[PDB]
Amino acid sequence: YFDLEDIGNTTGQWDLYGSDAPSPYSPLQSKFFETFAAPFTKRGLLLKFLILGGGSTLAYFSTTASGDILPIVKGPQLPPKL
Amino acid sequence: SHSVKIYDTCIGCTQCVRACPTDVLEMIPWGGCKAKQIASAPRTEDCVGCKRCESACPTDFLSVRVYLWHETTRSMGLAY
Amino acid sequence: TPPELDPNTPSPIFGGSTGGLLRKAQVEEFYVITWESPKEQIFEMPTGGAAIMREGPNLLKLARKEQCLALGTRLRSKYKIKYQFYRVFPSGEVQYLHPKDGVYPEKVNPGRQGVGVNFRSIGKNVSPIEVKFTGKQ
Amino acid sequence: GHFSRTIAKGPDTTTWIWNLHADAHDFDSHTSDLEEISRKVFSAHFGQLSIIFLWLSGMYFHGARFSNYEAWLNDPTHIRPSAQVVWPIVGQEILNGDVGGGFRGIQITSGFFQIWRASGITSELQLYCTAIGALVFAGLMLFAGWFHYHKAAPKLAWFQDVESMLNHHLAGLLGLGSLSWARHQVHVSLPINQFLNAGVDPKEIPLPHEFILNRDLLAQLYPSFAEGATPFFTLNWSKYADFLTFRGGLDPLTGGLWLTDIAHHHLAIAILFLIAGHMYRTNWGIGHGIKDILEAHKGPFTGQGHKGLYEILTTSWHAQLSINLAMLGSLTIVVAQHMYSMPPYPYLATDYATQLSLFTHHMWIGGFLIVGAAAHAAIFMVRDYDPTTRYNDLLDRVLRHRDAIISHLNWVCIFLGFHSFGLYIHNDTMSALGRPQDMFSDTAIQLQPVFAQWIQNTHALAPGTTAPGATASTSLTWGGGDLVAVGNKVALLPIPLGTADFLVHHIHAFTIHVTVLILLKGVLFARSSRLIPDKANLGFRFPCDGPGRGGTCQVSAWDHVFLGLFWMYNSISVVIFHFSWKMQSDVWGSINDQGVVTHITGGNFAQSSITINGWLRDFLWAQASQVIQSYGSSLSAYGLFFLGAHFVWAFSLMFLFSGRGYWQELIESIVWAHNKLKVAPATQPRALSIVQGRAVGVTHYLLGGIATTWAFFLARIIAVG
Amino acid sequence: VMLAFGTPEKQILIEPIFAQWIQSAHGKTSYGFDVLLSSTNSPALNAGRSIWLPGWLNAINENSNSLFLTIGP
Amino acid sequence: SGLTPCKESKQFAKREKQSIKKLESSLKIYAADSAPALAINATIEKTKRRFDNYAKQGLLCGADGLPHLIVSGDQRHWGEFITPGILFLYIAGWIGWVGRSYLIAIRDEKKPTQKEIIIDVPLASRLVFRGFSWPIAAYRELLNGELVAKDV
Amino acid sequence: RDLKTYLSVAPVASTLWFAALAGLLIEINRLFPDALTFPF
Amino acid sequence: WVQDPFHVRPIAHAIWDPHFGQPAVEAFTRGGALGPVNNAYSGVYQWWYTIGLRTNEDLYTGAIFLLFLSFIS
Amino acid sequence: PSLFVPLVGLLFPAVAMASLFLHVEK
Ligand code: CLA
Ligand code: CLA
Ligand code: CLA
Ligand SMILES: CCCCCCCCCCCCCCCC(=O)OC[C@H](COP(=O)(O)OC[C@@H](O)CO)OC(=O)CCCCCCCCCCCCCCC
Ligand SMILES: CC1=C(/C=C/C(C)=C/C=C/C(C)=C\C=C\C=C(C)\C=C\C=C(C)\C=C\C2=C(C)CCCC2(C)C)C(C)(C)CCC1
Ligand code: SF4
Ligand code: SF4
Ligand code: SF4
């Protein structure tokens, strides 16, 4: 009934489902976020920061009192033939 | 895409064409057999490689041979 | 032969399905098929079930090409109906395939060109050979 | 192919022989004449009934001449039920073992002994007659099929009158059948068994017919029978309540349901099926047009609905067969779970060997039939689905959003699989690393099945409150503080539900959902698919459509039944395992003088069935010791069949992991060796077809697998129970 | 079958007499075979000329090592 | 042959006694004169008999106390393999020769496959006994026991 | 009556043949059980 | 291990796993090691001892030499 | 010491899997 070689888009599911909403905005509080979230918006630079943020994992394990790394002590079993 | 070939050992029974669901083959005027026809493979781009054509061939061993080569969406038979 | 071309035609009655086009159509390709019915009949429709055929030009859009032929080969049987389908593309364009020659591929026609015909006969193929090609040229 | 002329034609390859049997019963492929088919299957049912009738005759006959039933009757607690005897040839006689009663025979698990005691049967004389009566019936049934195919075959119009058939089957067969049996109970079963429970001895029991003739003998007990006029015609009915009651629970001396209740049950069931029998329209006005009523239901969601169904279910056998197989199988399953929880036979629950094998047998039969529903449902789509002539609309939409249903069901299985099997892999890992606090256990982070525990709680407090007439509970698994102990064995006991019980139920949720997925996917996409737009033209049983499209192997609806067949095995196989361990661990056992109960495995289910290693050790490795140590004893055959099944099973993997292209090329070399020595058969040897190799594969897999547990279980409970 | 039937004396237990003949041919004095390196007169064992044989023949008749174990049905 | 004959065996002799005692244990609960009685006692005599026979015929018996067969070809133990083996090949050939003789007779004329699925031709004219002398197939070998179509 | 014979001449023939073979073998074993050798 | 090849278990390497519970670290502490280790079943101890390796220092020099051999490859 | 390295043996998969992903989609 409605196929138009002119517009190939409506013909296909090209249309954004009504879930799209191109409406206004949100409060001015954004002016704050835009200021402090800027260094993480660069990409690639952020890729690196997070990977080198893996330096946290090293720091957290080099220093860790309560993970089972001690026997605590025992007298070991010989044991099948010593 | 897939590579299909026809051989002069054909007898022009046209069953390979009727078997194809994508329309990869067709009949051709020729002087080699009594039917004076021969299979042709012009549209290999639409070939999916299912070998339905081979299972209709009556020649002692196939006159039409499908050689599965590079894969494409059409050959992969994808609808998405 | 001159391709007839398709402009606008009504679609057959159906009501919807989940086997229709999806994204591929938008960005790669989609195939449409046209056939004329002497009666508002009922046909199976692949990728779904039950659709009324309609009477008139009848235009349907599908994907994979094969879906169109399946319908077309069922359309030629059961009902004595002629049909034709094309590949739409995403930016207009007019590629018309099948019948093409205007006479069915199974029926021998006068000027087609062989394309990939080997006059050697099978079993007489060679063995490689590190050079380009496989020997079934 | 005897059935078809071209098929019969001539044999050129061995494939002809395999085809001949494969399509022997495929009646709708031999003719397009619906009447001819219907006539064929109707006669086939007679031939079936003859075989099962003959089957029954042999069970009664063997019970008479080759059994120690009489011996078992006087001492049911520690006499082993045994029918059939083995001739002393090539060392066979070892299978004849001590079963008590001074008799040498193989211990049985069919449960006929418990059935016969309930029926009030006392002598081999009585069993002898019933065997002959069955044979006489077998002669009739076989003759009846010959008469209705060659002499007087019904019209298609005859079979199509479904209304008349419905009315009868759920009234003439069900109602009067229940009623007729209800009479035998209170006149024969109840009187005689009442004596048997008083330790009177069978030969000292009067003959059943003496109870019927003179009321005197039957009236001294159950004194409601005393009145000749009977209070029935007075319509007070309160007086009758002595021979029938709503007591429920379990008799503490015989361990079965009170026959005092089953008689009342059938009395109700009978007329309930007699009334419901008067529903559909026939000839004398009063009744329903099922065609009309079906049409009435329609909906904003369904649009036209059910319209046209009556046409479909009156012209397509596969449609009716699928529905029937789906529920007859489902019925067999609920039968298994009702006979274990509510033991209906005298000295049945006490006989642990019979109960395990009864529950397990019904689970497989029920499981198989349901899988068969998938097949014929798919066969209907390929062979009988025609929108032009028989549109439904319900079927439509379903086909319309079929990519939706499967995709969702696909997700649920992944959610279930993770949230079932994953928990076990969690527990297996936390226990191996030495941290049981972490595991999903009753001792650690517990996942209590409070919903199931709540339903059981209300069943316990049901008698008196929401069930005044009920003196006791429905089943003692819902009892609370009750305990029945027949002999030194425990008949039944309240079954607890813990975190270990939460996991296993979620595994059954899983296995069933996946089995549904595989089967349902094959039915909907039986005709068309994005991959194969014309699958319906390839048929229902075809191997493939070539290596094209990346590979289209097992796209057939047949192959979906093939894949779902293994999964139905995987499914039940773990239900029966759940049953076996739970009953042995928390129910079955011996009760002492003080009242202390010791179970067979000693309550190790709760903390050891939460681990995979726990099933592999505390269950398999532990409970196998019987089967693998049965050599030189009466259970010798089970040990062999245990090994024999492991073989036919690994033998299946040969067919399943390979293809026929290899085999055909191998045969070529073998045919050459034959041609050299003039020993080449004119019927050229061919490999099995692609589809047959799958059929051969799954059969042996199921056989070897099923058979292997059979020997597992039957060796376990006999040596222990 | 017979062990199931409780009759292990009906088994087919073929003695690997060919292989046991090889073992005796190596120096094992088990079995009554009288073959090379364990026989009564031959060019083979005396070709030992001490050296390997005395230390090695000690090793073959060791009931502890895996050097030529005892074999059967 | 570290085995010492079943006669001077203490294990194989002990094994006999062990088996019959277990059988005797079973008849104690049935009371003689009864059916399960003979069946047990009949089993016992067969047990004694087979143990008795094995010692007669030789049979070496290992340390385990069970007879071990010797297939080396030793004349002392020919009855353990060679003589039954000769008997097998005889019947094995006989079957082979009769079967081959059948498919050959069928091939000329008729529909050959008809005879294969259905053989309402029994031993043909009289083909079975032809196997009584199969070994004379050695003389069929010097002529045309094999077809010359493929290789030699 | 030609018909019954043929009927008995299909794969059933195999059952009859193997039943006859089994009977022979079993009876042989009755007269000579526990045979581990041919001693004559 | 060298000082008593009969009654000591060779050590492949140490174990370091955060998922290990205390009973795990417990059970795997063997061969006179300060922490949980794996009992070597590759027979490298017998091989290295037989060819003449007696100290840890010797083992290190071999590791360095192989690391160097790995480079020139 | 040995409690610093098995994690970089797990930082490495994070790095490797990320890099390879970029390589294969390019
Ligand atoms: C009384 C003797 C008798 C005779 C001479 C015939 C003769 C015939 N019948 Mg009839 N039939 C009979 C009894 C008889 N029948 C009975 C008692 C029934 C009711 C079940 C039938 C139901 C019947 C049907 C539905 C059909 C025939 C047909 C035929 C014709 C073809 C034969 C055939 O089907 O192929 C094969 C011959 C066989 C004997 C097949 C074997 C089937 C039997 C019942 C197997 C027994 C079950 C077995 C024990 C299962 C366990 C196996 C276990 C060992 C593994 C032929 C004229 C067919 C026809 O008319 O052709 C179009 C046909 O459609 N018969
Ligand atoms: C309600 C009962 C019922 C009825 C009346 C039918 C009827 C039919 N079925 Mg169905 N089926 C059923 C249940 C039923 N089925 C169930 C529960 C399943 C799931 C397992 C199936 C799965 C199924 C498939 C996949 C197919 C059918 C097909 C058919 C049709 C013909 C096939 C045929 O002749 O059999 C042929 C009989 C054989 C080939 C014998 C095979 C050997 C058996 C399986 C071995 C059994 C082992 C034995 C029990 C134990 C070992 C014994 C041994 C060691 C001696 C016929 C209409 C076929 C069809 O195309 O429909 C038209 C088809 O392909 N059925
Ligand atoms: C336990 C499972 C199993 C068994 C028994 C076999 C057996 C065999 N395989 Mg197989 N295979 C298997 C699994 C198995 N395979 C698996 C999982 C794979 C990977 C996919 C393969 C891949 C494979 C390949 C690639 C090949 C084989 C081949 C063979 C044959 C080798 C010939 C031989 O040694 O003895 C002969 C036969 C046997 C030892 C078993 C026969 C079974 C019994 C003994 C027959 C007696 C029947 C008895 C009377 C029962 C009657 C039943 C009754 C209902 C009638 C043999 C039949 C080769 C072959 O075909 O050589 C010719 C070969 O090419 N196999
Ligand atoms: C948190 C605990 C509370 C429980 C609520 C959540 C659990 C139950 C799941 C909600 C499902 C909603 C059912 C609506 C009741 C319902 O089914 O409505 C039925 C509705 C009615 O249609 P009509 O009114 O047309 O029906 C009449 C005619 O159509 C037929 O003649 O039909 C449809 O919804 C069509 C679309 C199917 C809807 C598919 C959803 C299927 C859910 C799958 C889960 C099955 C669970 C079974 C467990 C035993
Ligand atoms: C002496 C002896 C021994 C040895 C043996 C040997 C070592 C040998 C050999 C052998 C050989 C190495 C042989 C060979 C060969 C060959 C050939 C080349 C063949 C052939 C054949 C044929 C040709 C056959 C045919 C036929 C017949 C005649 C019958 C039937 C079948 C047919 C028909 C199949 C031992 C010591 C062990 C034991 C003791 C004794
Ligand atoms: S393989 Fe399939 S698509 Fe290709 S030529 Fe053959 S039938 Fe056509
Ligand atoms: S099937 Fe073979 S012979 Fe027939 S038309 Fe095709 S190529 Fe020619
Ligand atoms: S191997 Fe078999 S199933 Fe797979 S593509 Fe080839 S023919 Fe089809």
Tab-separated table of N, CA, C and O in Angstrom, chain H residues 4-57:
chain	number	residue	atom	x	y	z
H	4	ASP	N	67.716	-36.401	51.285
H	4	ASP	CA	66.918	-37.578	51.618
H	4	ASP	C	65.898	-37.906	50.528
H	4	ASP	O	64.696	-37.864	50.777
H	5	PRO	N	66.378	-38.268	49.324
H	5	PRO	CA	65.540	-38.456	48.128
H	5	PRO	C	64.346	-39.390	48.329
H	5	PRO	O	63.392	-39.338	47.551
H	6	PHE	N	64.400	-40.228	49.358
H	6	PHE	CA	63.358	-41.220	49.595
H	6	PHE	C	62.127	-40.672	50.318
H	6	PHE	O	61.002	-41.075	50.024
H	7	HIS	N	62.333	-39.760	51.265
H	7	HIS	CA	61.258	-39.371	52.177
H	7	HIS	C	60.832	-37.905	52.109
H	7	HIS	O	60.299	-37.369	53.080
H	8	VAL	N	61.064	-37.266	50.972
H	8	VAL	CA	60.685	-35.872	50.791
H	8	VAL	C	59.968	-35.731	49.458
H	8	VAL	O	60.265	-36.454	48.513
H	9	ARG	N	59.024	-34.813	49.364
H	9	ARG	CA	58.276	-34.614	48.142
H	9	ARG	C	58.760	-33.456	47.353
H	9	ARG	O	58.865	-32.394	47.871
H	10	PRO	N	59.041	-33.689	46.020
H	10	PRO	CA	59.549	-32.534	45.262
H	10	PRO	C	58.519	-31.428	45.093
H	10	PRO	O	57.327	-31.702	44.998
H	11	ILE	N	58.990	-30.186	45.054
H	11	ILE	CA	58.108	-29.038	44.905
H	11	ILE	C	58.212	-28.430	43.511
H	11	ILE	O	59.294	-28.050	43.067
H	12	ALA	N	57.079	-28.349	42.823
H	12	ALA	CA	57.031	-27.746	41.498
H	12	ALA	C	57.156	-26.231	41.601
H	12	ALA	O	58.069	-25.632	41.032
H	13	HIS	N	56.234	-25.626	42.341
H	13	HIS	CA	56.192	-24.179	42.512
H	13	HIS	C	55.219	-23.817	43.626
H	13	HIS	O	54.480	-24.672	44.115
H	14	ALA	N	55.213	-22.548	44.018
H	14	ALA	CA	54.316	-22.088	45.071
H	14	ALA	C	52.912	-21.849	44.529
H	14	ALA	O	52.714	-21.696	43.324
H	15	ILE	N	51.938	-21.820	45.433
H	15	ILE	CA	50.557	-21.533	45.071
H	15	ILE	C	50.162	-20.153	45.576
H	15	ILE	O	50.409	-19.821	46.735
H	16	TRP	N	49.558	-19.344	44.713
H	16	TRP	CA	49.005	-18.073	45.159
H	16	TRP	C	47.623	-17.833	44.563
H	16	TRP	O	47.489	-17.430	43.408
H	17	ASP	N	46.598	-18.084	45.370
H	17	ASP	CA	45.217	-17.963	44.925
H	17	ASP	C	44.344	-17.315	45.999
H	17	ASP	O	44.176	-17.868	47.085
H	18	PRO	N	43.791	-16.131	45.697
H	18	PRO	CA	42.923	-15.384	46.617
H	18	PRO	C	41.655	-16.142	47.002
H	18	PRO	O	41.083	-15.886	48.061
H	19	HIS	N	41.223	-17.058	46.142
H	19	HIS	CA	39.989	-17.801	46.366
H	19	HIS	C	40.173	-18.879	47.429
H	19	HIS	O	39.202	-19.374	48.003
H	20	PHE	N	41.430	-19.242	47.673
H	20	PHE	CA	41.776	-20.252	48.666
H	20	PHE	C	41.236	-19.918	50.050
H	20	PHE	O	41.474	-18.832	50.576
H	21	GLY	N	40.503	-20.860	50.632
H	21	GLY	CA	40.089	-20.738	52.015
H	21	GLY	C	41.243	-21.163	52.898
H	21	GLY	O	42.223	-21.727	52.413
H	22	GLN	N	41.139	-20.889	54.192
H	22	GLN	CA	42.202	-21.256	55.123
H	22	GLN	C	42.477	-22.768	55.178
H	22	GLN	O	43.637	-23.169	55.269
H	23	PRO	N	41.427	-23.614	55.131
H	23	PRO	CA	41.727	-25.050	55.057
H	23	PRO	C	42.479	-25.453	53.788
H	23	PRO	O	43.136	-26.495	53.773
H	24	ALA	N	42.374	-24.645	52.738
H	24	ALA	CA	43.078	-24.928	51.493
H	24	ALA	C	44.563	-24.644	51.651
H	24	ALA	O	45.392	-25.526	51.449
H	25	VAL	N	44.889	-23.408	52.024
H	25	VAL	CA	46.267	-23.012	52.309
H	25	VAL	C	46.907	-24.002	53.276
H	25	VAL	O	48.100	-24.300	53.196
H	26	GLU	N	46.078	-24.518	54.178
H	26	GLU	CA	46.469	-25.546	55.131
H	26	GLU	C	46.965	-26.817	54.453
H	26	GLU	O	48.133	-27.186	54.572
H	27	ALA	N	46.054	-27.476	53.744
H	27	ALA	CA	46.292	-28.799	53.177
H	27	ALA	C	47.425	-28.828	52.159
H	27	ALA	O	48.103	-29.844	52.009
H	28	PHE	N	47.629	-27.718	51.459
H	28	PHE	CA	48.595	-27.685	50.367
H	28	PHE	C	49.999	-27.293	50.826
H	28	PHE	O	50.922	-27.224	50.016
H	29	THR	N	50.163	-27.039	52.121
H	29	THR	CA	51.482	-26.718	52.663
H	29	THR	C	52.257	-28.004	52.917
H	29	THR	O	52.017	-28.707	53.897
H	30	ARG	N	53.180	-28.318	52.012
H	30	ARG	CA	53.863	-29.606	52.026
H	30	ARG	C	55.346	-29.475	51.691
H	30	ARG	O	55.816	-28.400	51.318
H	31	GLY	N	56.080	-30.577	51.832
H	31	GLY	CA	57.487	-30.628	51.471
H	31	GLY	C	58.390	-29.673	52.230
H	31	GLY	O	59.454	-29.299	51.741
H	32	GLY	N	57.970	-29.281	53.429
H	32	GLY	CA	58.740	-28.352	54.237
H	32	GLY	C	58.824	-26.976	53.604
H	32	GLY	O	59.892	-26.365	53.556
H	33	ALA	N	57.690	-26.491	53.109
H	33	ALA	CA	57.626	-25.176	52.484
H	33	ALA	C	56.880	-24.188	53.373
H	33	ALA	O	56.000	-24.576	54.141
H	34	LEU	N	57.234	-22.912	53.263
H	34	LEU	CA	56.623	-21.874	54.088
H	34	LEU	C	55.183	-21.590	53.673
H	34	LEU	O	54.417	-20.995	54.431
H	35	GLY	N	54.820	-22.015	52.467
H	35	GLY	CA	53.474	-21.811	51.966
H	35	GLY	C	52.968	-22.986	51.154
H	35	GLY	O	53.707	-23.941	50.913
H	36	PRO	N	51.700	-22.922	50.726
H	36	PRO	CA	51.086	-23.969	49.902
H	36	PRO	C	51.782	-24.108	48.552
H	36	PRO	O	51.946	-23.118	47.838
H	37	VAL	N	52.198	-25.324	48.216
H	37	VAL	CA	52.883	-25.577	46.955
H	37	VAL	C	52.267	-26.756	46.211
H	37	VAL	O	51.362	-27.420	46.717
H	38	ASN	N	52.765	-27.006	45.005
H	38	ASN	CA	52.328	-28.153	44.219
H	38	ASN	C	53.397	-29.238	44.170
H	38	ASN	O	54.571	-28.957	43.927
H	39	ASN	N	52.981	-30.477	44.404
H	39	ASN	CA	53.892	-31.614	44.398
H	39	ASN	C	54.251	-32.030	42.975
H	39	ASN	O	53.416	-32.569	42.253
H	40	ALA	N	55.496	-31.778	42.581
H	40	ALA	CA	55.946	-32.030	41.213
H	40	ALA	C	55.942	-33.515	40.854
H	40	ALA	O	56.483	-34.342	41.585
H	41	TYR	N	55.333	-33.841	39.718
H	41	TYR	CA	55.307	-35.212	39.224
H	41	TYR	C	55.887	-35.295	37.817
H	41	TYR	O	55.524	-36.172	37.033
H	42	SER	N	56.789	-34.370	37.501
H	42	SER	CA	57.421	-34.329	36.188
H	42	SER	C	58.760	-35.060	36.199
H	42	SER	O	59.329	-35.347	35.145
H	43	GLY	N	59.258	-35.355	37.395
H	43	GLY	CA	60.507	-36.076	37.549
H	43	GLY	C	61.729	-35.243	37.214
H	43	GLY	O	62.787	-35.783	36.890
H	44	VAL	N	61.586	-33.923	37.288
H	44	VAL	CA	62.697	-33.022	37.007
H	44	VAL	C	63.755	-33.082	38.109
H	44	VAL	O	64.936	-32.838	37.861
H	45	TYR	N	63.324	-33.405	39.325
H	45	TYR	CA	64.234	-33.506	40.459
H	45	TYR	C	65.231	-34.644	40.270
H	45	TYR	O	66.431	-34.466	40.465
H	46	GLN	N	64.722	-35.812	39.890
H	46	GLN	CA	65.563	-36.985	39.677
H	46	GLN	C	66.504	-36.781	38.495
H	46	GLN	O	67.666	-37.188	38.541
H	47	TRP	N	65.993	-36.152	37.442
H	47	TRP	CA	66.774	-35.876	36.242
H	47	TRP	C	67.925	-34.920	36.537
H	47	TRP	O	69.079	-35.200	36.210
H	48	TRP	N	67.601	-33.791	37.157
H	48	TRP	CA	68.593	-32.764	37.457
H	48	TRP	C	69.620	-33.241	38.482
H	48	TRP	O	70.790	-32.866	38.420
H	49	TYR	N	69.182	-34.072	39.421
H	49	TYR	CA	70.073	-34.594	40.452
H	49	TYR	C	71.046	-35.616	39.874
H	49	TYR	O	72.211	-35.669	40.268
H	50	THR	N	70.561	-36.417	38.931
H	50	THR	CA	71.362	-37.480	38.336
H	50	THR	C	72.473	-36.929	37.443
H	50	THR	O	73.553	-37.513	37.349
H	51	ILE	N	72.210	-35.798	36.795
H	51	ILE	CA	73.185	-35.214	35.880
H	51	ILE	C	74.220	-34.362	36.615
H	51	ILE	O	75.252	-34.009	36.046
H	52	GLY	N	73.945	-34.034	37.875
H	52	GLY	CA	74.942	-33.385	38.712
H	52	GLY	C	74.584	-32.041	39.321
H	52	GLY	O	75.466	-31.317	39.781
H	53	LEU	N	73.300	-31.699	39.335
H	53	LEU	CA	72.864	-30.444	39.941
H	53	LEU	C	72.588	-30.643	41.430
H	53	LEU	O	71.728	-31.439	41.809
H	54	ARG	N	73.323	-29.917	42.269
H	54	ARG	CA	73.272	-30.136	43.712
H	54	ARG	C	72.756	-28.931	44.500
H	54	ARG	O	72.313	-29.079	45.639
H	55	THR	N	72.819	-27.743	43.905
H	55	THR	CA	72.409	-26.527	44.606
H	55	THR	C	71.401	-25.699	43.813
H	55	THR	O	71.224	-25.901	42.612
H	56	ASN	N	70.745	-24.769	44.500
H	56	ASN	CA	69.818	-23.845	43.858
H	56	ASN	C	70.553	-22.887	42.932
H	56	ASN	O	70.028	-22.489	41.892
H	57	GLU	N	71.770	-22.519	43.324
H	57	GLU	CA	72.616	-21.644	42.520
H	57	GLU	C	72.860	-22.240	41.137
H	57	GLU	O	72.830	-21.532	40.130
